[PDB]
Amino acid sequence: SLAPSHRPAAEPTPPGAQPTAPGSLKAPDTRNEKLNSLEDVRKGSENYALTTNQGVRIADDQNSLRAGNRGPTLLEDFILREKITHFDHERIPERIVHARGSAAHGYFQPYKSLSDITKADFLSDPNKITPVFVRFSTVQGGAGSADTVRDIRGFATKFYTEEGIFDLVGNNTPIFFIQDAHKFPDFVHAVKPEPHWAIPQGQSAHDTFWDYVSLQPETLHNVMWAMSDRGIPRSYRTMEGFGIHTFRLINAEGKATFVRFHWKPLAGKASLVWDEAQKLTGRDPDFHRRELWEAIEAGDFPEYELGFQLIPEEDEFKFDFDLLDPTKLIPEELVPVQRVGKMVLNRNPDNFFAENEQAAFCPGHIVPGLDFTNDPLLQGRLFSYIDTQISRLGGPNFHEIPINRPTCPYHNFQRDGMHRMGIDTNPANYEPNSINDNWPRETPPGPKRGGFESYQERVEGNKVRERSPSFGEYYSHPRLFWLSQTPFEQRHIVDGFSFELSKVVRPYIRERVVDQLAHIDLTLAQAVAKNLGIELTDDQLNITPPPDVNSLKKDPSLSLYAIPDGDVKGRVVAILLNDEVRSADLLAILKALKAKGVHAKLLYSRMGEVTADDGTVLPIAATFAGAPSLTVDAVIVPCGNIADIADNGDANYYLMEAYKHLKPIALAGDARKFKATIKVADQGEEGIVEADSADGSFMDELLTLMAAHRVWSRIPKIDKIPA
Amino acid sequence: LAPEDGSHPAAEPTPPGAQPTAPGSLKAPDTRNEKLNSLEDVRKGSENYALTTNQGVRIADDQNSLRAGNRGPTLLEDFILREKITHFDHERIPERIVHARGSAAHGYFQPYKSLSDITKADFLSDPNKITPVFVRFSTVQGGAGSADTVRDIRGFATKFYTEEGIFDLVGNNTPIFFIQDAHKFPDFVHAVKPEPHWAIPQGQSAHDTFWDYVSLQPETLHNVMWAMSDRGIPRSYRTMEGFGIHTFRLINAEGKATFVRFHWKPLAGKASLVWDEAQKLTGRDPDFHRRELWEAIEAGDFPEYE
Amino acid sequence: SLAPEDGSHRPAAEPTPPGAQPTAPGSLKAPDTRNEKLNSLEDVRKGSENYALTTNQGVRIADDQNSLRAGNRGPTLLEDFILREKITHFDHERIPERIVHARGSAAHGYFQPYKSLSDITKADFLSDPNKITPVFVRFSTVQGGAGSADTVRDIRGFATKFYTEEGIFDLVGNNTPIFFIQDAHKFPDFVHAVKPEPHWAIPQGQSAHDTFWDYVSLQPETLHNVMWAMSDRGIPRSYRTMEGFGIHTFRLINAEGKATFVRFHWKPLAGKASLVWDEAQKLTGRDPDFHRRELWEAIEAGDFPEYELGFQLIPEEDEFKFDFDLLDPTKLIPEELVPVQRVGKMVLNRNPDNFFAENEQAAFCPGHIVPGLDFTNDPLLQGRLFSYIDTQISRLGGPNFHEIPINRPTCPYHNFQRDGMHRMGIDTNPANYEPNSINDNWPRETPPGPKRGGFESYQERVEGNKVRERSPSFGEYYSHPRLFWLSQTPFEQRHIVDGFSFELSKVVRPYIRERVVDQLAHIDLTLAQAVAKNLGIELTDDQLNITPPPDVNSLKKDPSLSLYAIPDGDVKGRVVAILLNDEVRSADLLAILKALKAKGVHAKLLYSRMGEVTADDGTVLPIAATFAGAPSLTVDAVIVPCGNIADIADNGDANYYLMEAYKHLKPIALAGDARKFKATIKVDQGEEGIVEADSADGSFMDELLTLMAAHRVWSRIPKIDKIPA
Amino acid sequence: ISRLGGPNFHEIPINRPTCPYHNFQRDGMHRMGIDTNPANYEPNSINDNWPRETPPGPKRGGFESYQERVEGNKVRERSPSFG
Numbered sequence A: 001s002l003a004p005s006h007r008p009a010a011e012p013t014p015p016g017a018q019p020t021a022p023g024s025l026k027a028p029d030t031r032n033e034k035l036n037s038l039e040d041v042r043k044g045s046e047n048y049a050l051t052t053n054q055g056v057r058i059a060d061d062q063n064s065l066r067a068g069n070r071g072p073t074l075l076e077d078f079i080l081r082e083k084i085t086h087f088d089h090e091r092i093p094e095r096i097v098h099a100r101g102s103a104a105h106g107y108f109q110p111y112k113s114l115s116d117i118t119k120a121d122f123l124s125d126p127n128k129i130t131p132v133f134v135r136f137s138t139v140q141g142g143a144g145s146a147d148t149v150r151d152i153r154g155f156a157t158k159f160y161t162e163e164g165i166f167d168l169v170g171n172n173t174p175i176f177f178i179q180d181a182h183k184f185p186d187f188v189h190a191v192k193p194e195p196h197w198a199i200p201q202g203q204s205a206h207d208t209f210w211d212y213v214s215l216q217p218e219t220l221h222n223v224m225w226a227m228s229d230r231g232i233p234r235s236y237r238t239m240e241g242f243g244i245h246t247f248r249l250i251n252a253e254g255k256a257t258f259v260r261f262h263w264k265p266l267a268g269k270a271s272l273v274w275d276e277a278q279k280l281t282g283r284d285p286d287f288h289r290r291e292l293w294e295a296i297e298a299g300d301f302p303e304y305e306l307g308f309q310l311i312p313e314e315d316e317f318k319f320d321f322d323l324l325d326p327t328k329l330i331p332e333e334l335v336p337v338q339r340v341g342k343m344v345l346n347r348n349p350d351n352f353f354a355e356n357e358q359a360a361f362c363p364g365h366i367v368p369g370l371d372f373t374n375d376p377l378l379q380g381r382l383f384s385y386i387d388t389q390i391s392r393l394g395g396p397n398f399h400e401i402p403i404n405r406p407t408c409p410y411h412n413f414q415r416d417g418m419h420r421m422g423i424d425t426n427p428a429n430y431e432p433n434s435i436n437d438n439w440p441r442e443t444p445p446g447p448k449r450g451g452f453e454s455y456q457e458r459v460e461g462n463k464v465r466e467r468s469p470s471f472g473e474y475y476s477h478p479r480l481f482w483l484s485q486t487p488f489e490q491r492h493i494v495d496g497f498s499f500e501l502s503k504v505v506r507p508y509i510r511e512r513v514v515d516q517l518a519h520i521d522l523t524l525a526q527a528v529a530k531n532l533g534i535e536l537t538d539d540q541l542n543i544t545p546p547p548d549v550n551s552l553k554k555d556p557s558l559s560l561y562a563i564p565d566g567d568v569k570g571r572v573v574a575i576l577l578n579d580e581v582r583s584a585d586l587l588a589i590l591k592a593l594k595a596k597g598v599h600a601k602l603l604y605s606r607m608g609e610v611t612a613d614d615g616t617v618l619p620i621a622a623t624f625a626g627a628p629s630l631t632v633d634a635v636i637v638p639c640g641n642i643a644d645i646a647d648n649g650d651a652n653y654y655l656m657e658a659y660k661h662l663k664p665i666a667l668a669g670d671a672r673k674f675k676a677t678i679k680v681a682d683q684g685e686e687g688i689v690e691a692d693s694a695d696g697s698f699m700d701e702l703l704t705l706m707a708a709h710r711v712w713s714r715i716p717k718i719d720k721i722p723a
Numbered sequence B: 001l002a003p004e005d006g007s008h009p010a011a012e013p014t015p016p017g018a019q020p021t022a023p024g025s026l027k028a029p030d031t032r033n034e035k036l037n038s039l040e041d042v043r044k045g046s047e048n049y050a051l052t053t054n055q056g057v058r059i060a061d062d063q064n065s066l067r068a069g070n071r072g073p074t075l076l077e078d079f080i081l082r083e084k085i086t087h088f089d090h091e092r093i094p095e096r097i098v099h100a101r102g103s104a105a106h107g108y109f110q111p112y113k114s115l116s117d118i119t120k121a122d123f124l125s126d127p128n129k130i131t132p133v134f135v136r137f138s139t140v141q142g143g144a145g146s147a148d149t150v151r152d153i154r155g156f157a158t159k160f161y162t163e164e165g166i167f168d169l170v171g172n173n174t175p176i177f178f179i180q181d182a183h184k185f186p187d188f189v190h191a192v193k194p195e196p197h198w199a200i201p202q203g204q205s206a207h208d209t210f211w212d213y214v215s216l217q218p219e220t221l222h223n224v225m226w227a228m229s230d231r232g233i234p235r236s237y238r239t240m241e242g243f244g245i246h247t248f249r250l251i252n253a254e255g256k257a258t259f260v261r262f263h264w265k266p267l268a269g270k271a272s273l274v275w276d277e278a279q280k281l282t283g284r285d286p287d288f289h290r291r292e293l294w295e296a297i298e299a300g301d302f303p304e305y306e
Numbered sequence C: 001s002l003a004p005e006d007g008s009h010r011p012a013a014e015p016t017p018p019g020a021q022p023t024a025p026g027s028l029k030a031p032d033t034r035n036e037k038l039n040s041l042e043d044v045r046k047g048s049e050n051y052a053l054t055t056n057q058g059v060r061i062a063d064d065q066n067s068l069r070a071g072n073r074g075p076t077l078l079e080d081f082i083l084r085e086k087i088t089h090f091d092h093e094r095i096p097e098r099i100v101h102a103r104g105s106a107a108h109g110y111f112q113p114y115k116s117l118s119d120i121t122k123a124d125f126l127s128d129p130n131k132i133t134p135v136f137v138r139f140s141t142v143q144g145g146a147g148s149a150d151t152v153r154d155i156r157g158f159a160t161k162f163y164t165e166e167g168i169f170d171l172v173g174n175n176t177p178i179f180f181i182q183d184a185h186k187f188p189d190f191v192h193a194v195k196p197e198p199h200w201a202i203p204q205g206q207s208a209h210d211t212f213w214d215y216v217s218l219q220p221e222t223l224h225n226v227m228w229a230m231s232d233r234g235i236p237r238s239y240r241t242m243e244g245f246g247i248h249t250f251r252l253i254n255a256e257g258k259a260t261f262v263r264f265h266w267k268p269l270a271g272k273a274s275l276v277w278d279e280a281q282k283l284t285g286r287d288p289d290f291h292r293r294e295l296w297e298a299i300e301a302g303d304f305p306e307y308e309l310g311f312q313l314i315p316e317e318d319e320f321k322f323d324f325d326l327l328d329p330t331k332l333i334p335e336e337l338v339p340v341q342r343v344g345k346m347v348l349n350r351n352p353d354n355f356f357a358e359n360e361q362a363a364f365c366p367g368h369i370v371p372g373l374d375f376t377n378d379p380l381l382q383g384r385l386f387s388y389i390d391t392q393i394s395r396l397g398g399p400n401f402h403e404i405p406i407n408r409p410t411c412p413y414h415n416f417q418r419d420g421m422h423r424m425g426i427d428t429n430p431a432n433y434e435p436n437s438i439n440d441n442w443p444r445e446t447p448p449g450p451k452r453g454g455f456e457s458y459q460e461r462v463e464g465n466k467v468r469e470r471s472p473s474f475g476e477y478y479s480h481p482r483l484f485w486l487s488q489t490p491f492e493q494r495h496i497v498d499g500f501s502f503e504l505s506k507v508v509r510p511y512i513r514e515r516v517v518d519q520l521a522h523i524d525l526t527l528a529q530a531v532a533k534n535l536g537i538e539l540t541d542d543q544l545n546i547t548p549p550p551d552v553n554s555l556k557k558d559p560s561l562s563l564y565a566i567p568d569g570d571v572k573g574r575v576v577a578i579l580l581n582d583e584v585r586s587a588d589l590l591a592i593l594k595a596l597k598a599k600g601v602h603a604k605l606l607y608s609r610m611g612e613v614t615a616d617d618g619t620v621l622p623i624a625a626t627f628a629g630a631p632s633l634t635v636d637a638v639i640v641p642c643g644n645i646a647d648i649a650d651n652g653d654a655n656y657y658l659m660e661a662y663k664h665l666k667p668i669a670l671a672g673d674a675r676k677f678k679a680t681i682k683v684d685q686g687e688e689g690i691v692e693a694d695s696a697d698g699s700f701m702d703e704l705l706t707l708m709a710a711h712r713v714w715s716r717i718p719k720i721d722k723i724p725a
Numbered sequence D: 001i002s003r004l005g006g007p008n009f010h011e012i013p014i015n016r017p018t019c020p021y022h023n024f025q026r027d028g029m030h031r032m033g034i035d036t037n038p039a040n041y042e043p044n045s046i047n048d049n050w051p052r053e054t055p056p057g058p059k060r061g062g063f064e065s066y067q068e069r070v071e072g073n074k075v076r077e078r079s080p081s082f083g
């Protein structure tokens, strides 16, 4: 039964280099106080006897107890029943939303004290290090759904602070679909698989979603973000995070500052294109989950900068949108994002179910120095996140699940509940009590280590179910977003709408959405209608565009690519081998990739080994079909016996796929024969790196393109290629 | 809000893509059996009803929370909002430990002739005797949100509502299983399932722990052969075979026992995908088998098994 | 700043007698009392002192008196996360109670054997006299809910969790040596019958209703455990003063693979004592927590409950030697034919910190055995093994109930089991399956062996057809009820007659009553006639002519089946009520207390009011309770010293206390003028069980302590019918 | 939710309304009602928005809260008129 190696090195290694491992085995020296506090419940395996859950050693784990070798199984086999019972009861309900997610451990620290605007301990001192645990997610799909769907993305961060847990539960877009939490089930029911037949998974491309959008135009701003490349990010490390709601900062004087929370990716913003993303759901449904785990094992740590948009209290009415409306964004041109701190994810969990699946985040989990607002999406969220944990995690003691426990002290009069772990020794389970001298005791609010006290906001109104008239404007933020995109991003937004509405069965629904788009931008409205064979009426062509947002004609922070921010580190290249590789070419590629921290996968028509011309032996990471171009950032072909792969269907298709997906391609020497497969002229073109050998010049070319992420000049050429 | 022309489905058989898909009782009201009729008491309508709370209270405004003024904080006393969010917060139940991904439909079974000579099972007692059935088809490894056209075994579970009790014939699309003794089911299932540290990969046996177990346990090799074949990727649930796998007994009036193995034969015959096609289809439509089953029944192309 | 300045809120971490101080959780009450299970639980204990009050998330609370509201007189706000967490946790405090034995009381302890038993069993916990195993014990009733009374007429549960080096062993016993039914398949039928009736959910903690006696009448296998229940066994004085039994035959397995049949016995070192029914039924009113209280206080006092573990042992070749089937759980093995040899001592020396965390969540299953023990085909026991693991999935909310701290082994546990609700363990194992190469197949199987071996079943021969059929060897029902009956003292026999009579009187349909009586004619005619006469039923001539059942392997009687035939009394941990007056004779009270302290007997000082009285000599006496506040029901004996007797002589409650104690057969001691009370209980030369003297002479204290040693004054029974109490 | 094991406790018979009850709520543990509504959300056009909001009225109207004036600051504070 035994080992041969099976075991990965406990050192950073590149994707595919070694087998993946639990984080504590892979990187045992990677520590924070949260990671150390979990040692209590880590269970080892090596050199341990196999037992029952009651600690009884098992002699034979291959057989049921039966009356004779060929007899019936006996009721008295308690070893079998315990093992089957635990297996029969493994699953718990998945999250109603964001069921699909991937998580890792990390730490956060401030650049500088923010005591000026908040008395929150974790932002108080730039040498206090706060452990974090982060789950990224899709929204619509099940836990068993694909990563690279066209969906919103969740970005939930739990801070273990010295004065409590703070959960910042954000999405990768700065707004949300709906204004009031009362409509969350109608919206989620409409985007979810349809109730009769439970189709489709991880997709908004169905009737009930576009029906709801057509009748609820408050939706159109977050729809625009979804139909754009924001909807299909290259990686969790390459997307933005937003709190979405206005929130409050409270300082020691009781001054209230409005804030919006930002996460800025230091790896920069990168998205897929739709054909690649849709297909990547087939070839690797786990592509984001995997990219993340390997990036962290490789040492390419996900890094984010915390950003505040800050508005003083007297400025609440200064925009022509309402700050508490969560379908409106605050343009960075009006209010800039101030860098606050850095977050670094430097270690994977040990057990996915134990740590990721049971992790409970709540936007209500705030600390003194923060507070809420009357944003009515957020007001409703506060109730839900606690309510849902009672069924999902089997009771009100979900905070004693180890991933969830505070690192700081927690003492109160709360008692019992299912799976109670804490044994209280306090004579009293009530306050006020004399029998324990009233311990544990209330704490008055103060600058530091004070009890939580709400900001004393003035409330004046009647009890109403009424939407604020200040919320009833729906088109100007969709148009501000549209006008802020690069033409090629605009082309991608047109295509998202075109593709999803093309899957809508009822045409009256497709025509309705085209009418809303006319209220945003007639250029966009006419590009979508032409793709659906709809024709705008005169009334539609004469619809007046929405106002500017505070005189803004465009905001470039709203585009993924308008301002370059690309960093190549942690990206991967595909190298397509032949049976006699020119070692000179491969030597130089690997040295240039390594100096910039770019990983490579060596691929052939078969697994195992090939030999280079100087007799070096190359292990093959995957075949062409086994790891298609979908999975790499660029493609390199070195020289050798090119004839070996020149007539290979899979080798040819790999370049055609990458080319269609606008990826940089590098051909060395004879590999230029390959330019025929992708119909490139001898002179070549931008996006196709070519040379007699892979020189210093050749690798600089490849790496500069990789920094720009994709080759957008290629788009006019891609419609003709079949792939 | 409906279109004036009523183009928002016809209650008659229509081909795939022709009209929007609908619940079975709306699509085909004149299709009945005894089980479907017995379910009328729990069927809820919608047309002509006031929107209410679960307590039967009529809702005036379903677009808003109750708040202290227009831009006010939401109030705890809003029982209509809390009931709605609470029910939403509690929609999910645990999925099946195995065969979480599945698609089902209502049907009927009749025996060609009486089988009294070999079993006293009432549902096999007279020719043309109608027993209602409910059938669920499934993969094995994937969750409820995973793709239909994966490489896997397929489940073929039939619920027979007989005059003398429920008989569940719980079958697979191959005639053997991976393992000999039930004691090792959790070992085998943990092996083919997504790996415990990082929960990768979904709906595939193409990872180390599945083949490490197969390599150390050669009883697995017969079902592995079926799985590595085109049997592992059926073109349709309509186009695969069904098997009970175990030997059971038939018992007759006289108390005589006959060993038996169960088969389902598809009248539409055996057809499969090819791997590159099936892997891409998990991308282009992960609901392909679910959709096809549903549209085949709306079209009148009924899954028929012997 | 709320505690009193004299520090009277805090109890002393010293052994103190019942009522001396507030009761505390065990780790505060007795911090120096330790064992491996209790040391292992330190990691989950929460303190309180000098802690800020927070949310479960660690956020400090400024104001725990108020909900957040839009104004002073405003509506409450959804955004109040501190309110909702607090209420939410409160709204989800309760979990399902146990289907049976929902009412229970528990304590930590340790077990030690007298000598190595490694000749007959390879169980590590019996391997050496110096091997000390932590235990947690829960005693219970059966029928009632968690909120029902302790001193009901019912069976008591005696479940013991041994945390051994080679795994948890749960010995899940009852306080009688048999059960009501032969086959597990009928457990719900029998439990449904004794339980409250399904239409109106009546009655609680009582077998005295129609559906129970209907089931008994139609299932005579029940009659042997019913006799025990209708006896004084059904209402024990304390959990410390009852026997425990395994009930099933189990197996011992030694290193050679030799199998020895065993039946388990707990023998109480404090001896066997029981209430009488009138006292027991009344005590469910005066103190429904009486057993639970008595047990916590005995332990806080140092009066540690002690039991001796006993084995009845039968060679395998001896399986068919008796007149009854060893696998039949409605038959006992008489101590005359097979003796109990002493195996070890169990001592319960610490109370729990939190009743819900440790008692309510504790899970026992008789299927929890270790290498060196094994099952038999006892068809009641075969059925129990399925049920105890099935029930925990709902009751403890998932398959991870073993990770709840009380339930955790002290010994190591490693397997390929993963996930489930409230999963605590974070597995680092690359493999969640075996066989695996990726972790070198760890953790690994262990072959069976003399020490630290893997568990392997005894290779018992099985031959026969798949049948649902009761063994004809089980089909005898009357001879063990008869053996039990003839083994009882005549005063125990009347108590049995009165139990049947009282319970059947409650049965609304008379034919049910007549059928139970007809069953009794089959056990013994004397018992059968005494019941019929209390029910105004007349036995027919057929009934008068029923031939008695065989005796059991030639035994006319076994006296180990009687609570009292062979005395085993120990007065340590008993309680006397002392009835004060406003000018107590100091000399009497001084002598009384020093005599009780010397024998470890506790006292409570009672008056017509609370606070303090002054003795004749100026001594200040504090008052524990009023006569109504702590009635005679709650004590073993009553002592009235001399003084200003006139003060209490015409007190209604003071006279009733003497009459209640007297009717219930308790020892009563009167000094000096206190003798004038002899008139209320119609006693002058005096009688057995009334100790009287000019003063509390010390001979007087010797006479009283001797009576207490015999527990009750049985000679008194003929006199108590006259007394209206 | 914990005591009767999910959000469908209104479908336990003794708990059931005798009046009609229709909404967009779906699923939950032990769901008894099989909904035939093509829509599980509103506003919808696919079912013509059934079931529908009812305006408040003297008889058979929708529930609307009494429009009580709220004036105060957010406080955890006990009315001195209570003391």
Ligand code: HEM
Binding pocket: A094, A095, A096, A097, A098, A101, A135, A136, A137, A154, A155, A156, A169, A170, A171, A176, A181, A184, A243, A244, A245, A326, A359, A360, A361, A377, A380, A381, A384, A385, A388, A389, A392, B085, B089
């Ligand atoms: C501002 C818009 C929203 C954002 C950014 C947001 C963010 C998130 C995120 C990131 C998660 C996944 C957390 C995790 O990984 O465990 C989540 C889950 C959830 N959200 Fe939201 N959410 C939003 C709106 C809402 C609304 C309006 C509701 C209304 C009730 C809601 C209820 C929930 C629930 C019930 C879960 C599942 C909780 C669990 O099982 O732990 N969300 N949300």
Ligand code: HEM
Binding pocket: A084, A088, B095, B096, B097, B098, B099, B102, B136, B137, B138, B155, B156, B157, B170, B171, B172, B176, B177, B182, B185, B244, B245, B246
């Ligand atoms: C020949 C071997 C087997 C076959 C053909 C088989 C077949 C099936 C099928 C078709 C289902 C899906 C039922 C549905 O549609 O809901 C299923 C579910 C399941 N099977 Fe198996 N199975 C086999 C072996 C096992 C074994 C050995 C175990 C456990 C020891 C097991 C445990 C389960 C469980 C727990 C489920 C989930 C069912 C539920 O939640 O209701 N199966 N099986």
Ligand code: HEM
Binding pocket: C097, C098, C099, C100, C101, C104, C138, C139, C140, C157, C158, C159, C172, C173, C174, C178, C179, C184, C187, C246, C247, C248, C329, C362, C363, C364, C380, C383, C384, C387, C388, C391, C392, C395
């Ligand atoms: C001689 C026969 C039996 C004895 C001596 C016995 C003993 C006990 C005891 C002492 C307890 C309480 C354990 C505790 O304090 O937590 C108990 C509980 C229980 N017994 Fe039995 N029992 C017997 C027969 C049965 C049978 C036949 C069944 C079912 C097949 C059964 C099912 C249960 C269940 C479900 C509980 C509650 C389980 C739990 O929540 O832990 N018992 N039994």
